[PDB]
Amino acid sequence: MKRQNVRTLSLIVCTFTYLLVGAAVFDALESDHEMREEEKLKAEEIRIKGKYNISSEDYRQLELVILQSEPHRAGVQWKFAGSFYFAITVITTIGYGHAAPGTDAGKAFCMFYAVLGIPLTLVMFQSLGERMNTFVRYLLKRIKKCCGMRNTDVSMENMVTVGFFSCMGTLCIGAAAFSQCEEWSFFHAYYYCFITLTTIGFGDYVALQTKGALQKKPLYVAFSFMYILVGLTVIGAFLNLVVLRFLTMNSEDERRDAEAE
Amino acid sequence: MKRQNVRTLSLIVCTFTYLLVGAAVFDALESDHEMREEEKLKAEEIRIKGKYNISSEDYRQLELVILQSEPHRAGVQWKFAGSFYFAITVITTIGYGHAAPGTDAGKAFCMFYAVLGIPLTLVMFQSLGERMNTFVRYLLKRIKKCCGMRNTDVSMENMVTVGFFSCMGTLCIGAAAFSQCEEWSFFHAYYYCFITLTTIGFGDYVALQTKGALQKKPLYVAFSFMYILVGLTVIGAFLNLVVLRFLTMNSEDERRDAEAE
Ligand SMILES: CC(C)CCC[C@@H](C)[C@H]1CC[C@H]2[C@@H]3CC=C4C[C@@H](OC(=O)CCC(=O)O)CC[C@]4(C)[C@H]3CC[C@]12C
Ligand SMILES: CC(C)CCC[C@@H](C)[C@H]1CC[C@H]2[C@@H]3CC=C4C[C@@H](OC(=O)CCC(=O)O)CC[C@]4(C)[C@H]3CC[C@]12C
Ligand SMILES: CC(C)CCC[C@@H](C)[C@H]1CC[C@H]2[C@@H]3CC=C4C[C@@H](OC(=O)CCC(=O)O)CC[C@]4(C)[C@H]3CC[C@]12C
Ligand SMILES: CC(C)CCC[C@@H](C)[C@H]1CC[C@H]2[C@@H]3CC=C4C[C@@H](OC(=O)CCC(=O)O)CC[C@]4(C)[C@H]3CC[C@]12C
Ligand SMILES: [K+]
Ligand SMILES: [K+]
Ligand SMILES: [K+]
Ligand SMILES: [K+]
Ligand SMILES: [K+]
């Protein structure tokens, strides 16, 4: 009886203590960096606003104009290439938000589109991940036969090893690809890859948004979309191997508790 | 044998055709709206840049200054309240990106923090969702006993009804709460609630970012965090009821295929 509850409460208490350990570390890592940046930006504002004697209403309007032009200076978003990039970022839940629906009709359709798109996408990547893990298990057992191993067992530790180095590999191949095209540093390209395939998607870095690359370099658009849909497949297969048993075993324990009645 | 493959391929083909149906509709809904907005913003830029004779290097620097000041004009982010809000938006994968780690040390810690935080959060919300569905099943069967129903069965259709109206309810309670505090329209507040609890998180709308509300209105900070952690629990419970069987039945079918050997 109680086992389901004690594991639920221990998960909750673990989560909230993990948030506290998070928050106090992000304060320690960069409250001072924000404090430097604010002062430096304020000085640059004051000197420019003064040198041109910009009126407060004019500066406010210019600020709004700049902030709303930021999504357009990267090149036209809402054409088929960019609408396909957006649709990917909705149904996979990346949600960069480099562009977002302007009209209320766009917002309303985006909600109805996500409602159906996301269950479909979860079931697709989890099915294709289970196929990947089955294929890897076959090829690894055959590899042990070819290597003449003393037994053909393929333990959980072997699968978890190949899964983890598949994740590390696909992130490094992403970083090496994007750093050569977007001119980000390798570390920032790796950060962008991790934040994409994890589906966090802050959207401070966004691929393709460079001198109209969404229109002038369609082979690289194709790479970016295939990289998302393949990388999420590999991460999905890794969660399918390591984590998914824990989602169901609470219900399995409840079924066992009912069968013990 | 083939059933696992034909369902995998049909899911893939369904996903890609669903992306095409998406992209061609977002083009139809708002390519023209972008085309109007670009022209209007270009005219406002030209008139202001000309009226003050702003030099191109000065305008470029001012543009960078404005874009980097946007995350600070909302109030200081990296203090405990804002670091806790950020930590929520990482481990739940909302990822608004209203703020993002400035220093490379912040980025590196954010990656190690997400790696462990997200599996923990999935297991927490799926466990707590399974608890919610069990409790709802109990209370609904007792409600049928109290109402004197001709039988005490609690079918899937009854659970799916209560789950769906729980999702619709928690979104409406969110929209009614935020529209009264952020001064968004009710539709935009509902859009923000749906985009938050779906974990897409574009970050064009973000709660708390208003005249320092992260520091002056801590009771409303508390509401925003509880609304995220409760709303995701309800959405998690709904996916646990409707979708989760489809993630596993592909492996169950493979086990059956092995047992038939
Ligand atoms: C993706 C890779 C890099 C990391 C994967 C980590 C997860 C597999 C870990 C992280 C947190 C773990 C959970 C943290 C705490 C608990 C509570 C624990 O419950 C108890 O001990 C209660 C008493 C009992 O059930 O015996 C059961 C395991 C569980 C769910 C853990 C299951 C495994 C989790 C999800
Ligand atoms: C299912 C698996 C086995 C195969 C996947 C095939 C991919 C190589 C396809 C699927 C969708 C394709 C993309 C769909 C749409 C576009 C937009 C297209 O852009 C335009 O036509 C420009 C439009 C404009 O600028 O108005 C360039 C090709 C591209 C990126 C395609 C590149 C090739 C992709 C990624
Ligand atoms: C969250 C609410 C609002 C919507 C939930 C929708 C899902 C429950 C639907 C959406 C798309 C559906 C999938 C679309 C297509 C298929 C392929 C289908 O495969 C076959 O028919 C192959 C042959 C066979 O297996 O008999 C099996 C069901 C499945 C996975 C569906 C399972 C149920 C899904 C995930
Ligand atoms: C687990 C369940 C059953 C109970 C959940 C309790 C909540 C009501 C707690 C958990 C975390 C708490 C929050 C943790 C941290 C803060 C930041 C705090 O802000 C400050 O102290 C300002 C700091 C600064 O400005 O430097 C205001 C209260 C608040 C939002 C707390 C409000 C109450 C919360 C949401
Ligand atoms: K997400
Ligand atoms: K996001
Ligand atoms: K997201
Ligand atoms: K985002
Ligand atoms: K943004």
Author numbering:
A (entry chain B), B (entry chain A): 1 to 261
What did the paper state?
The related TASK-3 channel is encoded by KNCK9 and shares 54% overall amino acid identity with TASK-1 and 80% identity within the pore-forming transmembrane regions. To investigate the structure of the related human TASK-3 channel we used an almost identical expression construct (Met1-Glu259) combined with a similar structural approach to determine a structure to 3.3 Å resolution. Similar to TASK-1, cholesteryl hemisuccinate was also found bound to the same regions next to the X-gate between the M1, M2 and M4 helices, with a second site in a higher cavity along the M4 helices. The orientation of H98 is also consistent with structures of TASK-3 recently resolved by Lin et al. at pH 7.422. As found in TASK-1, the residues that surround the X-gate in TASK-3 are also involved in inter-and/or intra-subunit interactions known to influence channel gating in both channels.
TASK-1 and TASK-3 are pH-sensitive Two-Pore Domain (K2P/KCNK) K+ channels. Here, we resolve structures for both human TASK-1 and TASK-3 by cryoEM, as well as for a recurrent TASK-3 variant (G236R) associated with KCNK9 Imprinting Syndrome (formerly referred to as Birk-Barel Syndrome). Overall, our results provide further insight into the structure of both TASK-1 and TASK-3 channels and demonstrate that the X-gating mechanism is a highly conserved structural gating motif within the TASK channel family that, like many other K+ channels, also exhibits a degree of allosteric coupling between the lower gate and the filter gate.
